[PDB]
C-alpha cells in the first residue's frame, strides 16, 4: 500500500496572487491537481495534503476527493505533521510522471528509501548532491559547488521507517536509491508568473513533440496548446494557434484550421474545420464542414455531412444527416432532420424569458432567409417556410408556410 | 532641460516612402516614442532635426511644441546653434531608451558638463570604441579609424550625450565624437553610465532590425507584467503597444494585444486573440476567445464572447453578458442585462435585469442622422426585433418575436407582430 | 533536353500516415508538388516519377501532369529505382535527379548545377553541416570527388568529413544508359547503391562537378512529423525574412505564414499570425490586421483589413475598410472607399464606390452599385432549393435593417427600403418601399415565470 505526501503549505509570494501557490494553473488546471492526478494514477492507498495560507480555497477545490488534509501553521517539519512505503511530492513540482514515480518505488522497496537527482548544466544556487550528502548552495562551500547533480527533494520511504527517523529532527544511510527523471521539467518548481510560463513552454513544446510522434501534422507546434487529453487519428492537420482543452477525440484525416479552440469535444474522421472555430461540449460526425468562426456549445450534435458556415451558434441542438446552415444564424434548443437547409438570418426562438422550449425540424425542411421559429414548434418533412416569416403554428409535411410591401413614390430621405 | 533629437536619417533599406523615424514600433512612430521619453522628462524645450520627408513629419507631430531644424552627424547638432542649462542628444531612431536611464546620466553629467552613454558588447565591429586611460574617458575612435589594439575594446559609443548649453555653444563651432576630447582638452572629465537594458541604445536601419527590436521589446513588456504578477499563456505570443495597469490575478491567454491605454482589473481573464484598445474591465470579468474592445468601458463579473465587438462608448454595467457576434457601439448596458446572441446595439441605453434576442437591431441610422434607443428595466425583446430609433421600450416591456417597433412601447405593455400563418398545401420547391 | 527523375516511392514509415510520403504538407502543398513546380519552371522536357506504395493517390493527384510514372514495387535502393527509368530514359540529353521528400530546392540552384555539370558529364549538390553523423561522407582524393561513404560504413578519420551527400545528381543520360544496368547489389544491405555511379563514373575518367546550395534547407528531406515542422519554420522564417529585406513591416516575423506566393509594394504592414494562401497582392501602404488569412486575393493600396478578417478569391480595391471579422468569398469585388464591417459575409457579390455594410450582413450573387448602404440584418435570398438567383441594388440605395430582398430583384437608383421588409417586387428609382405597420399592443403583460 502506497502512500502520497503532497506539500501544498506556500504561500508563493512571488506570484503576486490573493491564492495559495499550488492553485496556480497551469495547462488549464491548479498545479496540485496535476499531482492529486498522478497520485491517483498511482493507485494511492492514502492521499495526504499539508495545507498552509489559504487552505479553506484548496480544500474547497478538491472537496470530492479522498484526501486526508493537515494544517501546517520548514519542509521536514511539514511533513512531521503527518505522523498523527510513502511517496513526498511538491505540491508546486506538478509534471511528475506517473512512470517515474513507479521507477521510483521499485528501486526504494528494496533499500527503504530513495530520491530523484537530476544533472543540470548550470547548478548555481540549487543543492549538490554512492550518495553521501546534499549541501545546499547557500550554505555549500566553493569547492563543492562545482557539483552539476542536483537535489530535487522527491523522495520515497517506508512508512515504518519514516516514523522513526522523523521525530528526532533537531541520516538514513547511518541506520540511499535515486533515479532520474526521464525529462528534466518533470521535476522542476515554479514561484513565480516568469517560472510558471516558462514551464508552460517547456510542457506544451513536449506535448507537441508527443503529438508529432504519434503521427500528427503541426504546421507549428510552438505555437500549439494542449490543456488536457487529445485521442488522435492518423493524418490529422492541426493547424496554427489551436487549443485544445479537456478530453477530446480527432478522429482520422481531421483538419483543424488556424485559431480553433476544441473544449470536450470529438470529431470524427475527414471534417475538416475552418480557422476560428469554437467547440464546448460538441459531438461532431464525419465529412463535415464547419467555419469559419462558427461556435458550437454544449448538446451540439453533427451527423455526418453537415455544413456549419460563419457567424453561426449551435446550442443544445442536433442536426441531421446532410443538412446545412451556412450562414449567421442562431439554432439552440433544436432537432433538425437530414438533408435540410437553414436560411441566414434563421432563429429557434427557444427562451419565453422563464423556460427553454423545442424546435423540431423535419427532414428536406428549408427554413427561408430572416425566420423567426417560435418554440414549441415543429416543422414537418418537406416543408418550406417562407423568408422573413414569423412561424408559431407547426407546419406540415410538404406544406408551404409564411407570414405586405407599401410603396410611397419619389421619397426623399432625411437630411 | 531641452531634447535635441537627429531625425533626418532616410533610411532606405526601410524601402518605404516615409522617413525613417516615422516606421512604428509597437503601434507609434520612432519619433513619437522619443518624443514622449522627452515629455516625461519635462523637457522645457524639444528641438528635432529633420531632414527628408520633414513635411510627413512635423505634420505627424502638429499638435506638440517642438522647435523644428531642417538639414555628418556633429555637423548635424552644429546646425543646431542657433536654436539653444543642458541638453540631451538621442536619435529618432533609437527610440526605446528609458527616462529612468536618461536621468541617471543626468545626475552624472551634471557633476562635469559633460557625459555620455555607453554600452558593453561581445562583438564591437563597426562601432566607436571608449578609449579610457585609467578608468578616465580621452576619447571616441570610430571603428574605421581605431588602431589594431583599439579594435579590442569592447566598451562602444551610442550618441547619447548630455552637455552643458553652456560649454555647447563654445565647442560646436566632420563628428560629434570628437566633442569628448575636446571636453578633456578643457579640462572635464566625461562621466559615463550604462543602459540598464541594452535594446535602449539600439537603433534600427530596416525591417529585419526593426521586428527584432519589436521583439525584444515584447518580451521585455511581457516579463515586467510576469513579475507583477500576470500569468501568460505564452508570454512569446503577446504584444504591448501603449501601457496596461493590471491587478492581481489577471490571466492572459496567447495572441492577446494591448493598445492604448487599457486596465485590467483583480481576476480578469483575457481569452485567446483578445485585442483591446483603450479599454478599462473591471475585476472578476471573464472574456471568451476573439473579442475586440475600443473605447469600452467594462463593469465587474461581466461574461464577453466569444467574438465580441466592443465599439467607443460601449459601456458595459456589472454581472452583464455578451455573446458571440455581438456589436455594441455607443451603447449603454445596465445591471445583468444579456445579449447572448448575434445583434447590433447601436446609440442604445438599456437598462438593468433585460434581455435582448438574437436578431435583435437598433435602426439607428435614417442615412444621415443618428437616433437613440433606449430599453428599460425587465424588458425582454423577443428575437429579430428591429427597434427603429428613436423610440422607447418601458420597463417590464416584452415585444414579440420578429417585431418592427417605431411607437414607443408602454412600461409593463406588450408588443407583438400580428403574423397570420398562411399555409399552401403539398408545395414542391423548384 | 534537361529531364527530372524524382523519387517518390517511400512508405514514409515514420509519419504514421495512410498516404505515401510525398503527399504530406509543406506550406500549403503536397511535398511531390513542390519539387514538380520547380521542374516545371526548368521547363523540363520530360518529368519520371518514381512511385511506389500508394502510387494510385499520387497518380491521381499530379493526373492533369504530363508524368511519366514509373513504379518500384520492391525498395531495394535509390540506385535499383533509377534504374527503372531506364526503359522510358532518354538517349540524348541530362537528367537531374530529385527527391520528392527534398521538396524546397531552388530552380536557381538547380540551374547552377547543369551549368557545371554540362562541362563534365556528371555532377551533383554537396553541403557542408557542423555534425555530419548519419550522413554519407564526400570522399575527396586531390580535391576530386571519388566516392560517397555511407556514416555505417565510414572509419574514424572518414567521419571526420563534414561534407555530406544530398542525393541530388545531374548525368548526362547517355552515361546513365550504361551505368544504371551495371549497378551491383554485392554488399551488405543488398541494396543497389546510387552512389555507385560516382565510382563507375571516375572509372570512366569522368571528373565530378559539385556546387553548394544557397541554402542548407533546400536539399532537406523529412521523415517524421518533427522534421516536417522543423523545415515547415525553416521555410517560413526565410520567407518572411525576404519579404522583410523587400519592405515589409511584420509585428513580429515568427508568427506568419506563407503557402504561396504573394506580391507587395512598399510600407505594407502584416500584423501577428497572418496567413497568406495561393496567389496574393498587397498594394502600397496595405495594412493586415492580426489573424487575417488571405487566399488567392488582391487588395488595393491604402486598404486597412482589421483583424480577423479572412478572404478567398477576393479581389478589393484602394482605401477600403474591412473588418473585423469580415469573410470574403470567391467573386466578392469591392470598389475603392468601400467599408465593410464585423460578421459580414460577401460572396460572389460586386460592390461599388463608397459603399458601406458595416454589420452583420450576408450579400450573396449581388450587385451593388455606389454610396449605398446595407443595414445590419440585411440577407439576399438567393436560393430557392434549386438555382442561385441575382440581386441588383443600384446608387444611394438605403437597405433598412433586416431585410429580405428576394432574388431575383432589382432595387432602384435612390430608392429606400424599411426596416424589416421583404422584398419580392422591383424598387422604383427614388421609391420607398416599407412593411405595413403590424404590432398590436396588450397592456399589462406577465411573462412566464
Do not use: M
Given at each position: 500500500s502506497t502512500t502520497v505526501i503532497i506539500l501544498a503549505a506556500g504561500k508563493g509570494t512571488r506570484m503576486r496572487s490573493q491564492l495559495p501557490k499550488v492553485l496556480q494553473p497551469l495547462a488549464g488546471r491548479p498545479l496540485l491537481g496535476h499531482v492529486i492526478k498522478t497520485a491517483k494514477q498511482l493507485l494511492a492507498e492514502n492521499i495526504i495534503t499539508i495545507y498552509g495560507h489559504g487552505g479553506d480555497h484548496?480544500?474547497?477545490?478538491?472537496?470530492?476527493?479522498?484526501?486526508?488534509?493537515?494544517?501546517?501553521?520548514?519542509?521536514?517539519?511539514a511533513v512531521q505533521m503527518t505522523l498523527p512505503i510513502s511517496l513526498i511530492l511538491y505540491g508546486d513540482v506538478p509534471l511528475v510522471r506517473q512512470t517515474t514515480l513507479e521507477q521510483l518505488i521499485e528501486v526504494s522497496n528494496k533499500t527503504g528509501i530513495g530520491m530523484i537527482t537530476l544533472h543540470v548544466d548550470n547548478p548555481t544556487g540549487y543543492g549538490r548532491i554512492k550518495i553521501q550528502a546534499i549541501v545546499e548552495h547557500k550554505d555549500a562551500t566553493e569547492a563543492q559547488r562545482q557539483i552539476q547533480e542536483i537535489n530535487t527533494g522527491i523522495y520515497c520511504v517506508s512508512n515504518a521507517k519514516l516514523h522513526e527517523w522523523l521525530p528526532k529532527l533537531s541520516m538514513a544511510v547511518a541506520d540511499i536509491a535515486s533515479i532520474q527523471p526521464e525529462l528534466?521539467?518533470?521535476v522542476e518548481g515554479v514561484?513565480?508568473?516568469?517560472?510558471?510560463?516558462?514551464?508552460?513552454?517547456?510542457?506544451?513544446?513536449?506535448?507537441?513533440?508527443?503529438l508529432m510522434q504519434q503521427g500528427v501534422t503541426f504546421?507549428?507546434?510552438?505555437?500549439?496548446?494542449?490543456?488536457?487529453?487529445?485521442?488522435?487519428?492518423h493524418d490529422v492537420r492541426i493547424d496554427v494557434n489551436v487549443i485544445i482543452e479537456g478530453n477530446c477525440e480527432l478522429g482520422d484525416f481531421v483538419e483543424i484550421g488556424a485559431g480553433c479552440i476544441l473544449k470536450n469535444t470529438t470529431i470524427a474522421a475527414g471534417t475538416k474545420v475552418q480557422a476560428y472555430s469554437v467547440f464546448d461540449g460538441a459531438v461532431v460526425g464525419e465529412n463535415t464542414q464547419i467555419g469559419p468562426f462558427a461556435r458550437l456549445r454544449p448538446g451540439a450534435k453533427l451527423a455526418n455531412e453537415v455544413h456549419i458556415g460563419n457567424f453561426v451558434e449551435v446550442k443544445n441542438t442536433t442536426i441531421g444527416l446532410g443538412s446545412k446552415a451556412n450562414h449567421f444564424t442562431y439554432l439552440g434548443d433544436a432537432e433538425i432532420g437530414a438533408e435540410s437547409n437553414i436560411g441566414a438570418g434563421t432563429?429557434?426562438?427557444?427562451?419565453?424569458?422563464?423556460?427553454?422550449?423545442?424546435?423540431?425540424?423535419?427532414?428536406?425542411?428549408?427554413?427561408?432567409?430572416?425566420?423567426?421559429?417560435?418554440?414549441?414548434?415543429?416543422?414537418?418533412?418537406?416543408?418550406?417556410?417562407?423568408?422573413?416569416?414569423?412561424?408559431?403554428?407547426?407546419?406540415?409535411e410538404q406544406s408551404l408556410s409564411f407570414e405586405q410591401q407599401i410603396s410611397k413614390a419619389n421619397y426623399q430621405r432625411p437630411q
Open positions: 484548496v480544500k474547497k477545490t478538491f472537496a470530492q476527493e479522498n484526501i486526508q488534509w493537515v494544517e501546517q501553521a520548514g519542509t521536514g517539519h528534466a521539467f518533470e514561484n513565480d508568473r516568469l517560472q510558471l510560463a516558462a514551464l508552460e513552454r517547456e510542457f506544451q513544446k513536449q506535448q507537441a513533440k508527443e504546421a507549428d507546434p510552438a505555437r500549439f496548446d494542449l490543456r488536457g487529453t487529445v485521442k488522435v487519428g432563429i429557434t426562438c427557444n427562451y419565453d424569458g422563464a423556460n427553454k422550449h423545442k424546435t423540431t425540424i423535419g427532414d428536406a425542411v428549408f427554413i427561408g432567409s430572416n425566420s423567426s421559429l417560435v418554440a414549441p414548434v415543429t416543422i414537418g418533412n418537406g416543408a418550406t417556410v417562407g423568408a422573413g416569416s414569423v412561424i408559431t403554428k407547426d407546419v406540415a
